[PDB]
């Protein structure tokens, strides 16, 4: 139950990821063999729930690619449920301030370090109580990544970076650009400056910067600035664009 | 992605609907061909979730009947999820006051007009980014219908009618009668007076009144008073009553 | 595990049925409460399989209405699987002669009376070995109903009626009229005479005649002639026709 | 729709239960025949949702074992949904004080006794309006069991016991031991003393004590002290431990 | 219910296709918007069944791309079921001779032209009896495509082409190369000559040649020779190869 | 893609198995961690199909326990489909003679050694063409186990054992005892002698004997005689018997 993604971040090894929105355990397996370091199972903007997360975790399990799950909100009940099905790395949307970051962290930890509900006999997370001393080992292998998605969050970043248990800070360029007045479109100097400044500041605190970016040149730029978990494409996009380009080549 | 239901309301064309609680994409398709103007996929009182809403939207899509979705609550996270799977007309339960109406509206609109989270690449709503300029076009095709279901809501109706983006106000007779002391049974003069007064007042503000009513005579009465989205039956009821009547005719 | 439908036919008590093509455990339960004596779960012309038959059986179980299952063909493997999930009454399509009727019967019976494969530890049929002496008791509670759907089958009816274990013979008017040259339209005197004569011949042989007929006056006619299992309507038709009629009343 | 579990508690007949976390309508049926008084469908620590609760209720229905459902949280919207699919006995997690206990109760009752939303035509709970006078009969057959899981809840127990409509108070030993500093492991004198004291105090108020305990000797001890709903094992545990022991016997 | 794919082949308009093996109604919709003329829902080499074919048909329905379904075998029972959920164009594998081609055709046609079983009240194919004169109109809109996959089938091609109702003949290069001794590797001159000669012979008989080929230059070659239904890629391959290429660009 | 179960049988290392009839990917994972050498996914007597076999394969994949799949019949089409989702070890029921054994073997092998259809781009079996030279490597890692379940099959055992590609012969005591006139009750000396003699004859031919037996002392006896794949219990039985015993201890 060692969290190898968490360990790679702490060691400064950049992790290249693919976003999964196809909400299918079958395509998840197909993509798990493609060579990524991590895969993001999106519970916020794709039609997933705890049960489909579970089947995608099962599909991914024998492969080297490490799963990360995005809950629909920073909701301790939903987080509890995701952790019991075996989630160990969470990408939490819309974290606006340090109090919210701390709540995300505490939702992942058993008392006294947090408020995670205890239900080990029933949980894939403990392999139904086969993992010895699960209750004592679990807190240390949880990896909490928080998303900053607004001007308010950018302003609070220093305080967020000070929250123990926040392992990574992810910048969401679509939401951030929208909040900044550019309608979800991030290729604007002001948006890029905000993104790049944050990446530097995050890395300077010893924490991992993350981002999703489908432009490969920008992905490399962010990596050069110190980003450590970078998602470089989206399954639905890869499929739709490849199919459309193919059809067009035949008229 | 033009919302034709929204446009019909704005033009004063009454829309006759059927409520869908069978929670099945197969019966949804069968009913989509029956000639209704709109179909209500009930996420509040039927066993639906975001995934079953999606498959019912897919089933309904080639037919002329327009889908409307009822979330389980006025919850911005659930609303975000429903919109990303392609919902454009929402019937929001238990809206008690103008602040709650405004929150329902803002949950449907991208910044700065609202707080809708951006996730277009992943969404059926944008057809996975095939709809050009989706982010700029989407807000205008969202149709927000709010339910008034209590004496408190009836008292706040004038203020609710003043909220921009509230396109329609729906009266729920079962909940309202229960709140008024008649245990969910609306055939009482006091309940009828409250319902009919509201319909007039709603229509007078230039907004669309709506209601569900399985009594056909009352449905016509409400339409005569200016109601514009009237659901005139429920799939589960139509099926159960037809089957029971058939069995009884054979002993 | 007593087969009450089988016992009712044997006692000459007419059983009034409803056909289930909605392929849903949810609507199956709703309909199980409507007062029918039997419900036909259609695996031939509706999108069912062994798994959906199982869930419909579970839904129907606490109600008085008795389930009957139609496999897609007279296939001993498919019959084996349906019996293991708990099916005790089978309506077998396209039985053309006595050899085929005997094959259907033998598929339902353990050796030496048949070729039914043994796997009771695993099966709902034995309640996972909780029913005592299941292997000894099962054969006697199987009820095999065979469909005659062609002129060839009608010619062979006398021989079919002589097969031990054939408890009932069902006439399919749609298939039969098509075979006779009337394109699935059974309201033609030559077709009605063939159906009436069969019903009489079946009843005179001391076996149960069955049929499906959505015309309530024809149903009553066939019951008058001695039909013992008569399905009087179809769920999809009930729902579609009720919905269409309702929409049309509002224009 | 009489709630026989509720009645057994009120009469002081101890009810022996099994916890269901396999989240399957198939194993639920298999276990429903095993001889327990009650079965707990866990929506908090197993991958269930309203739809899987529904299918497990359907599977259990013909058996004598009575279902109890644990929602993921004391959430009135989730409770509304569970009740409409037919849940009549709820085990509510993390009830910390009398206000929260009262909210749990009110979520189960129609106005004016509570805030349960009205949606009877659509609901399995009313058998789609077949149960006569459902709206007037339902409140009295709801059984609310609240979990005390923290030192704070133990301190508030007297006040919780004073809340009308709280039928039972359940002690969760894993969560309680964790909150008390023993990492989810309850075999410590301080934890046992707290548990046994609570059971006595609960029973003294005329309300039903409950607990889950897989140690059979402790289960008997708690029953001797007056516990009335005692779950004595967990499906996932029974299966995993039996399978592991079997494999080990063969090397 | 006009079969537009069938009409296009008959008019000699080349139709460009994409193979669907992801077995998902969700990715089917995403791909239905990509601009292909036809989409092949593979029930032979992907984990589909009648139920998943149905949901993919529903997903594809509002788009211009036309569905074609491959059953697992030339099995009249399976064909009956696929046609009842709405399939109008079938790609039948392993058709070895004229008798087998005639069997495939007859499985799709109502008596007297075939043995298709009648069950239109129940079926999506007739929109649950809403399509007027369905029984009379259906035969003419069925399009049967047969696969020649062996040397034996190639030898019998002239006779196969003479079967009335065979609208198209599809060459499977993987199976054919394997049968000819090149282990599913069709890039060998003896295999390419057999494929080219077949394409020409098919087109000269006034029927439509088809093929699947992921090499875009070979596809263009076969179109130049007269192939009329050409699948140019496979969803799983598009996705896997795009993902793998992306991961590799980041090392 | 090395078949480790096949290699263990060939090396004479006894493999201890558990039968899986719960038809759930969730319980399959729980059981995959219990320490068995092999797990039998039963498609003949449990409600499985190709789709549920796939998800169970995915669940089991990261564990050491090796999957074996039983199709419902010796059907080459069903075998093709099971192999494409990744099945490498098959337990084929009701193999009565050498011709049928050879048919089972040939169904698993690509031409010229068999008739397995080629569709590797699409299949999990090749990891969607990611396994290099899959077409060349696959045949050698298929393991075919045939069931002898009748007196006729026992008579033909010598010839069956002479079929190249038959790696193991499994005796089904339930079916065999039924065929011999002991109604699925194999605890009769004539049945035990037939089973013992078969085990010895199989092992002496240099092939692997197998059996299912829930009596642990008989299992140990058959292992002593040379049986190489022995299933020692069934999931549904383990669960049902553990639950029933537990309930009974509390009365
Ligand atoms: O659980 C059954 C669903 O609600 C209807 O498909
Ligand atoms: O509803 C379709 C799912 O989201 C994809 O399997
Ligand atoms: O995801 C697997 C379910 O939780 C058990 O049926
Ligand atoms: Co975002
Ligand atoms: Co309401
Ligand atoms: Co018929
Ligand atoms: Co607890
Ligand atoms: Co082929
Ligand atoms: Co057997």
């Amino acid at each position: 139950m060692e969290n190898s993604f968490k360990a790679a971040l702490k060691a400064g090894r950049p992790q290249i990821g693919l976003w999964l929105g196809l909400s299918s355990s079958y395509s998840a397996e197909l993509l798990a063999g493609a060579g990524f370091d991590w895969l993001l199972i999106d519970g916020e903007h794709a039609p997933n729930n705890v049960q489909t997360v579970l089947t995608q975790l099962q599909a991914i399990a024998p492969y080297p690619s490490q799963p990360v799950v995005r809950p629909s909100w920073n909701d301790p009940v939903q987080i509890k449920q995701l952790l019991d099905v075996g989630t160990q790395t969470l990408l939490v949307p819309m974290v606006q301030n340090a109090d919210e970051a701390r709540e995300a962290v505490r939702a992942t930890r058993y008392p006294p370090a947090g408020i995670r509900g205890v239900g080990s006999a029933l949980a894939r997370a403990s392999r139904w109580n086969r993992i010895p001393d699960y209750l004592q080992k679990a807190n240390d292998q949880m990896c909490v990544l928080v998303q900053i998605e607004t001007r308010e969050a950018m302003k609070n970043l220093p305080q967020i970076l000070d929250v123990e248990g926040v392992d990574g800070v992810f910048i969401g360029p679509a939401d951030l650009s929208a909040d900044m007045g550019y309608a979800g479109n991030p290729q604007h100097p002001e948006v890029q400056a905000a993104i790049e400044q944050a990446i530097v500041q995050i890395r300077e605190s010893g924490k991992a910067p993350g981002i999703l970016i489908a432009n490969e040149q920008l992905a490399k730029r962010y990596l050069e600035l110190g980003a450590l978990f970078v998602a470089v494409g989206v399954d639905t996009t890869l499929l739709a664009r490849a199919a459309e380009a193919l059809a067009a080549r035949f008229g």
Side-chain angles (χ1 to χ4, degrees), chain A:
Chain A
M1 63 172 296
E2 161 90 7
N3 185 334
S4 65
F5 175 89
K6 178 174 181 160
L9 296 187
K10 186 178 177 180
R13 300 192 282 277
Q15 299 294 281
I16 303 309
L18 188 70
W19 219 260
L20 300 187
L22 283 163
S23 307
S24 168
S25 56
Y26 192 61
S27 65
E29 177 169 14
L30 181 156
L31 291 168
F36 295 88
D37 300 311
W38 62 291
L39 300 166
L40 194 278
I41 300 163
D42 192 350
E44 187 194 15
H45 282 293
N48 280 305
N49 63 5
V50 169
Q51 145 77 349
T52 66
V53 168
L54 164 66
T55 61
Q56 284 167 87
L57 295 178
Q58 292 181 313
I60 291 163
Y63 293 90
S65 303
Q66 295 299 301
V68 178
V69 182
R70 174 153 77 169
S72 65
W73 194 247
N74 184 14
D75 169 17
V77 176
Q78 186 183 161
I79 288 169
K80 164 182 61 194
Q81 296 178 295
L82 291 167
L83 297 191
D84 281 330
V85 299
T87 299
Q88 290 183 295
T89 304
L90 280 175
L91 178 59
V92 182
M94 289 292 333
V95 172
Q96 292 283 85
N97 60 53
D99 286 345
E100 295 177 8
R102 184 171 301 105
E103 291 157 10
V105 174
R106 289 177 64 77
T108 70
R109 292 171 171 192
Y110 290 125
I115 57 160
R116 185 180 175 196
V118 180
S120 168
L122 266 321
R124 180 172 172 275
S126 72
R127 302 303 190 270
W128 303 277
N129 263 332
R130 283 194 197 107
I131 299 179
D133 299 317
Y134 174 81
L135 286 182
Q136 292 78 23
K137 295 179 189 164
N139 285 3
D140 285 350
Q141 302 308 315
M142 296 303 183
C143 180
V144 179
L145 312 171
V146 300
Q147 293 194 229
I148 54 175
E149 312 210 73
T150 69
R151 295 168 296 160
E152 171 72 17
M154 287 295 182
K155 174 187 75 75
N156 291 327
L157 177 58
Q159 291 67 55
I160 292 166
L161 295 173
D162 284 341
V163 172
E164 189 272 313
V166 170
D167 299 316
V169 175
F170 176 97
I171 302 134
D175 274 309
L176 178 61
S177 60
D179 190 66
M180 282 173 82
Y182 308 95
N185 153 65
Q187 301 184 340
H188 281 271
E190 288 83 4
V191 179
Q192 297 299 310
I195 292 172
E196 298 190 12
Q197 290 167 7
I199 292 175
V200 169
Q201 190 164 350
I202 291 158
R203 190 63 190 278
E204 179 178 3
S205 71
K207 290 176 175 200
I211 190 157
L212 168 60
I213 180 59
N215 185 298
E216 296 189 35
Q217 292 62 53
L218 293 177
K220 274 160 191 186
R221 187 180 300 177
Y222 301 153
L223 285 161
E224 286 166 355
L225 290 168
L228 288 174
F229 55 113
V230 182
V232 299
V234 181
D235 58 354
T236 51
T237 306
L238 292 186
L239 182 59
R241 299 300 89 80
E244 284 155 20
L246 175 61
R249 291 191 293 272
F250 281 89

